Coordinates of C-alpha atoms in Angstrom, one line a residue:
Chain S
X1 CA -10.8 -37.0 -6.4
X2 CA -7.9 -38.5 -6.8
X3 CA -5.3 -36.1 -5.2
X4 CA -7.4 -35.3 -1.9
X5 CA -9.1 -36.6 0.5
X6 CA -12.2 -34.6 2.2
X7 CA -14.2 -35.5 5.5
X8 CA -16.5 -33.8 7.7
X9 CA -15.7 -33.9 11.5
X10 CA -19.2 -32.3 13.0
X11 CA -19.8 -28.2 11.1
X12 CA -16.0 -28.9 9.7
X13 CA -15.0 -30.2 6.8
X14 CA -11.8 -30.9 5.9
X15 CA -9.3 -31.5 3.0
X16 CA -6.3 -33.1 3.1
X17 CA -3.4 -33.0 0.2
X18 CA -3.3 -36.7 -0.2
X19 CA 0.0 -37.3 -2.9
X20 CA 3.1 -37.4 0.2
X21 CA 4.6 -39.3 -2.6
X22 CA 5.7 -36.0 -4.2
X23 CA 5.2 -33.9 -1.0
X24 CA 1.6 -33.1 -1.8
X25 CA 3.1 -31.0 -4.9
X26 CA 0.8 -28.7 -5.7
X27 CA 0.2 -29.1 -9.8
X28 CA -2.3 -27.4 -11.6
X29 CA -4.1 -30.8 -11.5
X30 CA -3.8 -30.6 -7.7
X31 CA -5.1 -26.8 -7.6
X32 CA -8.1 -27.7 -9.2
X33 CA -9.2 -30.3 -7.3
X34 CA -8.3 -28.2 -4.2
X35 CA -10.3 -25.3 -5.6
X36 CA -13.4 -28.4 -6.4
X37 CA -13.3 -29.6 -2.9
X38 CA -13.2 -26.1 -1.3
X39 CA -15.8 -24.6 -3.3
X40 CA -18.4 -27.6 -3.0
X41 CA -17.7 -27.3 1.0
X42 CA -18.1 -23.6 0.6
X43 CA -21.2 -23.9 -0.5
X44 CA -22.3 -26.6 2.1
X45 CA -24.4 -24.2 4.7
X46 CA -23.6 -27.6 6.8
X47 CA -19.8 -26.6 7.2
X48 CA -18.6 -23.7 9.0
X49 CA -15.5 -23.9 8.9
X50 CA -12.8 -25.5 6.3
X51 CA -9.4 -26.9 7.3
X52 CA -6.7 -27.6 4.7
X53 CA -4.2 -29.7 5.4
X54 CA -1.6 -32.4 4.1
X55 CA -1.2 -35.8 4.3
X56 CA 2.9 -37.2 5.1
X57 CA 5.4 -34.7 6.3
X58 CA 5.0 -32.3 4.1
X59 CA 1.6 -29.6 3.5
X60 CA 2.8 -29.1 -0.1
X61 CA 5.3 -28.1 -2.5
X62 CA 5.1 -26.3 -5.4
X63 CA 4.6 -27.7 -8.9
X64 CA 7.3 -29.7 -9.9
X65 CA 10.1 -29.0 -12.3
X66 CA 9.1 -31.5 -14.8
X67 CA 5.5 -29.5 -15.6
X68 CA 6.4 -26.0 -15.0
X69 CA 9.6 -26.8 -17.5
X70 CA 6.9 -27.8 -20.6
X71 CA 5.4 -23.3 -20.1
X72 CA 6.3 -21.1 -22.0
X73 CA 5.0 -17.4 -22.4
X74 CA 2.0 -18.1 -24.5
X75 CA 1.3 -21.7 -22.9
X76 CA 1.1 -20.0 -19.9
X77 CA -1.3 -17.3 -21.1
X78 CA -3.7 -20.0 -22.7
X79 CA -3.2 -22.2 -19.5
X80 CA -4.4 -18.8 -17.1
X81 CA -3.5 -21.5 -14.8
X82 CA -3.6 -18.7 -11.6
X83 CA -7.7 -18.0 -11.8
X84 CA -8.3 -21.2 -10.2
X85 CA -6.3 -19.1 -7.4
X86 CA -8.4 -16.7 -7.6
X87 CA -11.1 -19.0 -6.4
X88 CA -9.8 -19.8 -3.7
X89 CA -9.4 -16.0 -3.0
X90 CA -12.8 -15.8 -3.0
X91 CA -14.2 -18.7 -0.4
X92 CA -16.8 -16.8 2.0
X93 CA -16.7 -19.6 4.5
X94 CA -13.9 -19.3 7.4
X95 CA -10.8 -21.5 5.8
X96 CA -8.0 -22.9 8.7
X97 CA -4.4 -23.8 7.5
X98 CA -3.2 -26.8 9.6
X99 CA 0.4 -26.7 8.3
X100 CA 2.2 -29.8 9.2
X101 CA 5.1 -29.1 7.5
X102 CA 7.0 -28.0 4.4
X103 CA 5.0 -25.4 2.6
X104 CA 6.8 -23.9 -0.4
X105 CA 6.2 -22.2 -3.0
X106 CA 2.7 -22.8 -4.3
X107 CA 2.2 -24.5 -0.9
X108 CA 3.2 -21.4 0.8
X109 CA 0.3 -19.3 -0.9
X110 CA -1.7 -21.8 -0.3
X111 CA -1.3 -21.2 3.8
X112 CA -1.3 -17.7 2.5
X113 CA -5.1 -18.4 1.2
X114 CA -6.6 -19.4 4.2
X115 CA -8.0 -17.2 7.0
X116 CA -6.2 -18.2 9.7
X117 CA -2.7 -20.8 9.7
X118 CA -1.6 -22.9 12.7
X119 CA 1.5 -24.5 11.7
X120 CA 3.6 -27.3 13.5
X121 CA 7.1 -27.1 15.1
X122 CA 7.8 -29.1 11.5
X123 CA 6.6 -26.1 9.2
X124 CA 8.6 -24.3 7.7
X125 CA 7.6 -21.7 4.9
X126 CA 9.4 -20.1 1.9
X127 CA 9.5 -19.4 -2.2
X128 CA 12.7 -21.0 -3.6
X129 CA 10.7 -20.3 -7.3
X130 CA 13.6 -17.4 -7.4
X131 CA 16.1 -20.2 -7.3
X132 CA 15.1 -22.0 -10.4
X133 CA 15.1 -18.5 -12.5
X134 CA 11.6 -17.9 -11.6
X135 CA 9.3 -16.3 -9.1
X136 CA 5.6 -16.9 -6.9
X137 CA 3.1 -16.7 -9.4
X138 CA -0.1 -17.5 -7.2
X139 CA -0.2 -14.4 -4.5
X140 CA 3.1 -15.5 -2.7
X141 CA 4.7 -11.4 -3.4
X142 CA 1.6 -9.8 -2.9
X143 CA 0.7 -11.4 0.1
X144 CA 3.3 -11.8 1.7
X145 CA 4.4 -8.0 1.2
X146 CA 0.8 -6.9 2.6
X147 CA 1.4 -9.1 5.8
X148 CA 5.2 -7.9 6.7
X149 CA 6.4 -5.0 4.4
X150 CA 8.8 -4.7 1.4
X151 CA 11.8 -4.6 3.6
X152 CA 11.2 -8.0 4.8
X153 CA 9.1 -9.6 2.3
X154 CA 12.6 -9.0 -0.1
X155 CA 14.4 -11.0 2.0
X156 CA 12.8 -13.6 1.6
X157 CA 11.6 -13.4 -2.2
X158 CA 15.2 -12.5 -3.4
X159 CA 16.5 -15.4 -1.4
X160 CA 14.1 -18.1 -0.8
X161 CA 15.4 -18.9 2.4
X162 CA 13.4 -21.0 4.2
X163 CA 11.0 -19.2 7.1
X164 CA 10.8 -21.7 10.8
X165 CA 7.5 -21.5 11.8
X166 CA 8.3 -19.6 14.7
X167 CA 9.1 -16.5 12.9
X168 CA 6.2 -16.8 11.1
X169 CA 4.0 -16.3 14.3
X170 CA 6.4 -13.5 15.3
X171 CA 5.9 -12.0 12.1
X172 CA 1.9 -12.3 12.2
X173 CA 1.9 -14.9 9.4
X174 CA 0.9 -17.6 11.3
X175 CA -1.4 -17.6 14.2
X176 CA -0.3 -20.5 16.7
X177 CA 2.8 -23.0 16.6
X178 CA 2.6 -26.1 18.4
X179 CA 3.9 -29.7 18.0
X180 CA 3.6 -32.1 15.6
X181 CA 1.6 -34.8 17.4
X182 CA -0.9 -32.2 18.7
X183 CA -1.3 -30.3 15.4
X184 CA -5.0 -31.7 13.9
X185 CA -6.3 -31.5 17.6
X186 CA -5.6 -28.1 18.6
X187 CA -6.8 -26.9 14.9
X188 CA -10.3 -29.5 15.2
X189 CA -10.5 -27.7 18.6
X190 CA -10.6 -24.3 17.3
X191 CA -12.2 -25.3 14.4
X192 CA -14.6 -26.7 16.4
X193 CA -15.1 -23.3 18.6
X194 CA -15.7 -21.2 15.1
X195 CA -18.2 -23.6 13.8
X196 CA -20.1 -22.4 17.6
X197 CA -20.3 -18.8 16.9
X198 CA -22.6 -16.8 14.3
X199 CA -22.0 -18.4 10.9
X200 CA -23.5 -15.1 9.0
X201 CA -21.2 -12.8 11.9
X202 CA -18.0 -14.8 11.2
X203 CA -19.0 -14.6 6.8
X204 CA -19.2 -11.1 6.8
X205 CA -16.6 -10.2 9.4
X206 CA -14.3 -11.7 7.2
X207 CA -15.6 -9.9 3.6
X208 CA -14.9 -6.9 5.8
X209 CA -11.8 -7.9 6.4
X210 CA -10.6 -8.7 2.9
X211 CA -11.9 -4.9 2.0
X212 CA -9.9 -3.6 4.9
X213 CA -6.5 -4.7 2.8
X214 CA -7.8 -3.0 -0.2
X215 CA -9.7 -0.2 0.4
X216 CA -9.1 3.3 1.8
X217 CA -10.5 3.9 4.9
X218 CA -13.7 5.5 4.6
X219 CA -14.4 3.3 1.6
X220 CA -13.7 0.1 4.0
X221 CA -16.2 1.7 6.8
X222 CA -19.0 2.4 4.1
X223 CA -19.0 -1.4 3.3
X224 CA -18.3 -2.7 6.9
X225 CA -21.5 -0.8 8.1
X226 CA -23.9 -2.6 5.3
X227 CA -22.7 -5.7 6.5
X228 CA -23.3 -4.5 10.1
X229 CA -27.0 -3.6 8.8
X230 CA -27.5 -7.1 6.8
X231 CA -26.9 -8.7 10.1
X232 CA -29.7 -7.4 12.2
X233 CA -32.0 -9.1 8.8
X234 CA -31.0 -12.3 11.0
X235 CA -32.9 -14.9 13.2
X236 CA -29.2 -15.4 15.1
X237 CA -28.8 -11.8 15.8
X238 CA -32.1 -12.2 17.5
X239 CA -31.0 -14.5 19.4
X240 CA -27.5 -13.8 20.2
X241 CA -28.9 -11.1 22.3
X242 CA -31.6 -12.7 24.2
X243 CA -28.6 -15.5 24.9
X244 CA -26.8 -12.6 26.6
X245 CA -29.2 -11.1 28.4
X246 CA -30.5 -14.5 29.8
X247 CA -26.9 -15.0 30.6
X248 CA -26.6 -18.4 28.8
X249 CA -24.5 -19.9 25.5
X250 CA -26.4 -18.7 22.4
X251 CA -27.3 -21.7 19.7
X252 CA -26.6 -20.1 16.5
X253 CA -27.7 -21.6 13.3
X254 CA -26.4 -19.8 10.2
X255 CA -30.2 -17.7 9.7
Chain B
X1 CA 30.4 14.0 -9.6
X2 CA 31.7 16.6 -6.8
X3 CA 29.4 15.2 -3.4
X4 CA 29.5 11.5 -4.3
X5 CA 32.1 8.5 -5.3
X6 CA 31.1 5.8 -7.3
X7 CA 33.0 2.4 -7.6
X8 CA 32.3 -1.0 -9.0
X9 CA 32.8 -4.5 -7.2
X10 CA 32.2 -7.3 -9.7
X11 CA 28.4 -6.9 -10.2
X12 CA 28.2 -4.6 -7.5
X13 CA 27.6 -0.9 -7.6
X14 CA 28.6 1.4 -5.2
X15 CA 27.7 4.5 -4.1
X16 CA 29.5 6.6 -1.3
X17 CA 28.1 9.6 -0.4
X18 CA 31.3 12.1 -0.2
X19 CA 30.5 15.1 2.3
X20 CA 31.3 13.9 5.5
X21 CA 32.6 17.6 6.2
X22 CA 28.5 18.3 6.2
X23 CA 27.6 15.0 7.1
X24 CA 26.0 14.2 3.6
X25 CA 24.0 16.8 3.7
X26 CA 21.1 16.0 0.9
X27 CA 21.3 19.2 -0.3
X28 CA 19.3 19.5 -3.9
X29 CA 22.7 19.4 -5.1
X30 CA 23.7 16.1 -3.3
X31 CA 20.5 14.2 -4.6
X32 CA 20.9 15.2 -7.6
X33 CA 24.5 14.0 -8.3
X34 CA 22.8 10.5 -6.3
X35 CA 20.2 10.0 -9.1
X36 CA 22.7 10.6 -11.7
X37 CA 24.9 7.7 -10.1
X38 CA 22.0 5.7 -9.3
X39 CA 20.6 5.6 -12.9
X40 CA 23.6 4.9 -14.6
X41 CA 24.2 2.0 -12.5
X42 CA 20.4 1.0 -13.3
X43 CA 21.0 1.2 -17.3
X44 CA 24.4 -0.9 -16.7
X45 CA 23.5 -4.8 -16.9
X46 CA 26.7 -5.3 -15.4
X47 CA 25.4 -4.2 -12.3
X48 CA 23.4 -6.8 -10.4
X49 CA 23.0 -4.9 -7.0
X50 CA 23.5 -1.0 -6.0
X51 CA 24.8 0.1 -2.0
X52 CA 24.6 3.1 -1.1
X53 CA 26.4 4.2 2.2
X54 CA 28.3 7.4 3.5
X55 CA 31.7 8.5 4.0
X56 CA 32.4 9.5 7.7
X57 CA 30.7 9.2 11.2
X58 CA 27.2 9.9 9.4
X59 CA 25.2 8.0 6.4
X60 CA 22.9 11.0 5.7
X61 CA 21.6 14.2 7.1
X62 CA 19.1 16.1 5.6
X63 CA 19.2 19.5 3.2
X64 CA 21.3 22.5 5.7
X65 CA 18.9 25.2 6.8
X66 CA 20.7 28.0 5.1
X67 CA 19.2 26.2 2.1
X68 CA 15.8 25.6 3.3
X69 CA 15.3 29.2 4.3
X70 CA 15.7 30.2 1.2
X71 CA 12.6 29.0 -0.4
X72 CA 8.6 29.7 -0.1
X73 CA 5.8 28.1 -1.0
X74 CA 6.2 29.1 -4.9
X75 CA 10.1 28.7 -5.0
X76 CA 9.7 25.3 -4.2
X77 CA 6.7 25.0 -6.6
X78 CA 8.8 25.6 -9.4
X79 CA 11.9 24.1 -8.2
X80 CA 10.0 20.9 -7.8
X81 CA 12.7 19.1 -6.0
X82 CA 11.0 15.8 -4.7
X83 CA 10.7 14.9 -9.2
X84 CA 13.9 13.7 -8.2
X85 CA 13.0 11.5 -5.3
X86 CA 10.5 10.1 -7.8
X87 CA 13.4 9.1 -10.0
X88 CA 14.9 7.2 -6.8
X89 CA 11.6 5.2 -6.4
X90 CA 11.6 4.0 -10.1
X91 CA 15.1 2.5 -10.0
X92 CA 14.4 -1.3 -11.2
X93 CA 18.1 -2.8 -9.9
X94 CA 18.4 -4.0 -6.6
X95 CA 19.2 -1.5 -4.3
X96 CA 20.7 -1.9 -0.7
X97 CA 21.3 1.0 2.1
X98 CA 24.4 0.8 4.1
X99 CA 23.6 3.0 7.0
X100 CA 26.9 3.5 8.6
X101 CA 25.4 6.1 11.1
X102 CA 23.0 9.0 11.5
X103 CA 20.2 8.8 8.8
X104 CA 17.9 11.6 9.8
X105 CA 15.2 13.4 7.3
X106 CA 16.2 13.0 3.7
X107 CA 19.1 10.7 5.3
X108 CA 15.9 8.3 6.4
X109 CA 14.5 9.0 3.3
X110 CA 17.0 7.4 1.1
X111 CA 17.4 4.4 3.4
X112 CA 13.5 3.8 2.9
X113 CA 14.2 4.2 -0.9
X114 CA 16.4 1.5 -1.2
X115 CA 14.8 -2.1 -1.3
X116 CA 17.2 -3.8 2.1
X117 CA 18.5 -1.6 4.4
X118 CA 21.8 -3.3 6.7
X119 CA 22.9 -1.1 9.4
X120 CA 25.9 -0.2 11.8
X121 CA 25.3 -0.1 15.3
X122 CA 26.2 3.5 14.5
X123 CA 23.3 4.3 13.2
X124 CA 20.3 6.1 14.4
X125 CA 17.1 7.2 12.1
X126 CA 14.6 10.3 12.4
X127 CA 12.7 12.8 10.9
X128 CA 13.4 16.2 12.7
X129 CA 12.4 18.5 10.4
X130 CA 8.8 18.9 12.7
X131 CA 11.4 20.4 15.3
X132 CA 12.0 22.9 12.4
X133 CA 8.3 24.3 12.0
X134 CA 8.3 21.5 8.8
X135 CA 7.8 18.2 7.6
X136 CA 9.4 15.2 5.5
X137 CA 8.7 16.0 2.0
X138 CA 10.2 13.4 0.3
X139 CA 8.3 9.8 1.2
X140 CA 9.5 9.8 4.9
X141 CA 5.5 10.3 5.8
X142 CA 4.3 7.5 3.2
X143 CA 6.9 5.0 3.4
X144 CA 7.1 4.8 7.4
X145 CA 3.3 4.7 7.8
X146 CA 2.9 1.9 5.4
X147 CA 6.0 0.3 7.3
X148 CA 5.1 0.5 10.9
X149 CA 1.4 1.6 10.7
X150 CA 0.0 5.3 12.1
X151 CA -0.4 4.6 15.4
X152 CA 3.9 4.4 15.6
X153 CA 4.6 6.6 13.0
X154 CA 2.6 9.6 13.8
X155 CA 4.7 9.5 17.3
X156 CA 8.1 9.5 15.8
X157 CA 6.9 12.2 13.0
X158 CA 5.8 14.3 15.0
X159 CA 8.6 14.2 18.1
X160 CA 11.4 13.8 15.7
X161 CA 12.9 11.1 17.7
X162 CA 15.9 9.3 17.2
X163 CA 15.0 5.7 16.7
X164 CA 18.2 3.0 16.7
X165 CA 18.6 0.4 14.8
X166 CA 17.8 -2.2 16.8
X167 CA 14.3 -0.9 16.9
X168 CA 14.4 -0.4 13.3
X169 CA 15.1 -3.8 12.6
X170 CA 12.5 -5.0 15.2
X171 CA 10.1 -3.0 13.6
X172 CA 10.8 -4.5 10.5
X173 CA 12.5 -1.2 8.7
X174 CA 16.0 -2.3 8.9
X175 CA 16.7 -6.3 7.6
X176 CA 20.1 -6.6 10.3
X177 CA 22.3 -4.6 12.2
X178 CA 25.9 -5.5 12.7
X179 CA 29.0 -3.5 14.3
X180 CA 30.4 -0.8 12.5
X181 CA 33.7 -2.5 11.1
X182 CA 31.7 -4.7 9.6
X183 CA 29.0 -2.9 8.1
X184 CA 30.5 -3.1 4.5
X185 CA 31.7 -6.5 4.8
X186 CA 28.5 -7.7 5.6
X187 CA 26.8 -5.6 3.4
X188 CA 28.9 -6.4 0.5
X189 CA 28.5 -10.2 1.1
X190 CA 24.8 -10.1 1.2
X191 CA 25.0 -8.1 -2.1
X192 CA 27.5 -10.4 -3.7
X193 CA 24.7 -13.7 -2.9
X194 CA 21.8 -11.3 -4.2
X195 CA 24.2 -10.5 -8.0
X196 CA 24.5 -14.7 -8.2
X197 CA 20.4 -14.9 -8.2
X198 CA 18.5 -14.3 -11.5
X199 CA 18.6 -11.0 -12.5
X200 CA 15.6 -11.1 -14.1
X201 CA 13.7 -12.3 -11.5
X202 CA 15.0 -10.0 -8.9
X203 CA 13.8 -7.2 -10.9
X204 CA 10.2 -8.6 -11.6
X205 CA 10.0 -9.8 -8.2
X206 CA 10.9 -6.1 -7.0
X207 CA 8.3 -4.8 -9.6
X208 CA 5.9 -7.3 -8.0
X209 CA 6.3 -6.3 -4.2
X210 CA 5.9 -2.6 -5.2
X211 CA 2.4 -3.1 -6.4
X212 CA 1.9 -5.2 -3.6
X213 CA 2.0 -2.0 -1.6
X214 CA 0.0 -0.2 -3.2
X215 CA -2.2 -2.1 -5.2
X216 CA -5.5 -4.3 -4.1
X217 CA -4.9 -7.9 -3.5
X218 CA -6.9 -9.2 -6.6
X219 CA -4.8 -6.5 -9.0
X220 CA -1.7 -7.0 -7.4
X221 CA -2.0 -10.7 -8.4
X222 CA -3.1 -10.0 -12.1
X223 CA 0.2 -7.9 -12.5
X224 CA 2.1 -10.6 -10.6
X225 CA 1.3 -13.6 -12.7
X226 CA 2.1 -11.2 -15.7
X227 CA 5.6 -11.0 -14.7
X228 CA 5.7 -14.8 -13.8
X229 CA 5.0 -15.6 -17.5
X230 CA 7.7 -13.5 -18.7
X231 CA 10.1 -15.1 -16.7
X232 CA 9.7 -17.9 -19.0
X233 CA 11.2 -16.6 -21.7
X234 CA 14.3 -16.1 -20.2
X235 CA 17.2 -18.6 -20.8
X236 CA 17.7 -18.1 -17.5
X237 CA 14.5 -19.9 -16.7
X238 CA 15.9 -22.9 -18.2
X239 CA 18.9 -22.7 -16.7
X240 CA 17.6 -22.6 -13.4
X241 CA 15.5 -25.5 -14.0
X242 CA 18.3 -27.7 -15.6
X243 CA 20.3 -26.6 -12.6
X244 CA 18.5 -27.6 -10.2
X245 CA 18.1 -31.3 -11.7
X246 CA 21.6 -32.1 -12.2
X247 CA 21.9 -30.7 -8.5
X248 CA 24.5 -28.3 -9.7
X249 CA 24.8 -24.7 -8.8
X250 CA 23.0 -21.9 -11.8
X251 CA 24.8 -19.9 -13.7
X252 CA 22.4 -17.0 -14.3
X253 CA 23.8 -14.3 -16.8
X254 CA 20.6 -12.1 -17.3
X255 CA 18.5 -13.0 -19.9

C-alpha cells in the first residue's frame, strides 16, 4: 500500500488514510486500497473490530478536481468506480470511524460506511460536490437521508454547508464527540471493549441491523430470528451463559 | 386562477394561496388550482425554486366540512381526489413551504410536500380530522411517520394536537422558524441562494433523497450513482469545476 497505513493494536486492526499531503483525498486509487485493507482485515477472524482513520488534520476529502474533471458519462460507466463502495457496504466485521477532522464529500460517506463514528471537536462533515455542479455519488444522499429525513438531509445536500461535529451527535450521525488529543484513545478504548464481547453476537447483530433499514417489519423479524437460531450453533453462546450464571466475565472466542 | 396568486421573483416562483376569508381552505377546488400553478412553474426552466405560503393569519386549513359530508365511500372512489396530491409529490423543482400560520390537515399536508419547510412563529401544524370521525388522506399518515417515527406520530394522529413550530423544527420537520415579519424575507433569501446552485443537480439530488426514502440502501445507491454520471454531461459540471479553480464564484445556467 502506498496510500494507507494498517496496524493491529490487540483484536483491532486499524487503517489510517496516510496522503495529509492532499487531505487524505479519497481517489478511486485511495478507495481501492481502503476497500483492500478492509476486506483482508475483514476476513482476519483475529480482528474484531476495524477502525478507519486519517493521518494529518484531515480524515479525508473527496476526489480531487483534477481526476473527477477527466469523467465523462460513459468513462464513468466503464470506470463503475462506486462498486468498490459497495464493498465496503458489505464488511461483516464491526467497522469504527475515528474522525479527526474534515470529512467531505467522499470522506463523509466514508464515516457514513462505518458502524459506528466518534469524531473530534476538529470534525466537521459535509458534501460541497453540489458546489462544483455535481453531487455524492458513493451513498452520501441515501445515507444520510435514511439517518435524518429529507427535510434535513436537503439542507445540507442543496447547500453543502459544512455539518460541526456536534450537530452530528445531536442528529444521531455520530456517536461520541471529544477532543482532539484524546480522539485514538477513547476510540482504541471502545474498540478495545467490542473486541471483548461475542464476535459471532456482535456479526450478526449488525447484518440484522443493516436489514432493519431495508426491510419491512415482519420481513426484518423473519431474518433477525435465524440469526438468533445460528447463535445457539455456538461454543460462546455456551459459555456466555455459564459466565452469567457463575457470575464472572465470559472469555469469548469468535466459535 | 380564482383561490390562488402566482408571481415571479427572478428565478423564484411564488405561490400564495388566496382565501384567507376560509383560511385556505384545501377544498378539491383549491388543490387543484395549486397543481395547476405548481406544474407550470415545474415546466418553466426559468424557475429555479417554488414557495408556497398563504395570504392571511393562516398558511392552510384543510377541505370545509360542508364539503366532506358530502361524499361516501364510492363518491370519493370515483372522484379520486388524492391523484392530485400524487401530482404534488412528483414536482422535480425545488419546492419551499412558507408556513406563515396554521397548517392543519391538508394545510400539514402540503408543507410535508414541499422539499424545506421555513416557518413563522405563527404557525402551528396538526392533523384533526381524527376529531372528525376521519383521517389524513393525503400523505399526512406516511410522510409524518417516516419523519418522526410511530411511536410520535401515532400520538399526534390520533389526538389531533396542535404541534408548534419549534417542536417541528426540533423534530426535524420544519428546517427554521423565524418571526412572522420576516417569514418571507427569510424565506425568499434562502430561496434566492438555493436558484444560484446548479439546477441540475438540485433536481437529481432531490430525485436521489426521494428514493432514499423509500428505497433499500444498496438500490438507492445504484439509482444514485446513475444520476451522478449524468451530471457529467452538463456544462454546468464544467463550470463548476473551472470555478472552483480559478477561486471564482459559478455561474450555473442549467444545463
Amino acid at each position: 500500500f502506498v496510500s494507507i497505513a494498517a496496524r493491529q493494536e490487540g483484536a483491532v486492526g486499524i487503517i489510517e488514510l496516510a496522503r495529509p499531503d492532499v487531505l487524505n483525498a479519497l481517489s478511486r486509487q485511495m478507495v481501492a486500497e481502503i476497500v483492500a485493507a478492509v476486506e483482508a482485515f475483514d476476513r482476519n477472524e483475529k480482528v474484531r473490530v476495524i477502525v478507519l482513520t486519517g493521518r494529518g488534520r484531515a480524515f479525508a476529502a473527496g476526489a480531487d478536481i483534477q481526476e473527477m474533471a477527466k469523467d465523462d458519462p460513459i468513462r464513468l460507466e466503464w470506470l463503475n468506480q462506486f462498486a468498490d463502495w459497495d464493498r465496503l457496504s458489505i464488511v461483516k466485521t464491526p467497522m469504527i470511524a475515528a474522525v479527526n477532522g474534515l470529512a467531505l464529500g467522499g470522506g463523509f460517506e466514508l464515516a457514513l460506511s462505518c458502524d459506528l463514528i466518534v469524531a473530534s471537536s476538529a470534525a466537521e462533515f459535509g458534501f460541497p460536490e453540489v458546489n462544483l455542479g455535481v453531487m455524492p455519488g458513493a451513498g452520501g444522499t441515501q445515507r444520510l437521508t435514511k439517518l435524518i429525513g429529507p427535510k434535513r438531509a436537503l439542507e445540507w445536500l442543496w447547500t453543502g454547508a459544512r455539518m460541526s461535529a456536534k450537530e452530528a451527535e445531536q442528529l444521531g450521525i455520530v456517536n461520541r464527540v471529544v477532543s482532539p488529543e484524546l480522539l485514538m484513545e477513547e476510540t482504541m478504548r471502545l474498540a478495545g471493549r467490542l473486541a471483548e464481547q461475542p464476535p459471532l453476537a456482535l456479526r450478526l447483530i449488525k447484518e440484522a441491523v443493516q436489514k432493519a433499514v431495508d426491510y419491512p417489519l415482519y420481513e426484518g423479524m423473519q431474518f433477525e430470528r435465524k440469526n438468533f437460531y445460528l447463535l445457539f450453533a455456538s461454543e460462546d453462546q455456551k459459555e456466555g451463559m455459564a459466565a452469567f450464571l457463575e457470575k464472572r466475565k465470559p472469555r469469548f472466542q469468535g466459535k
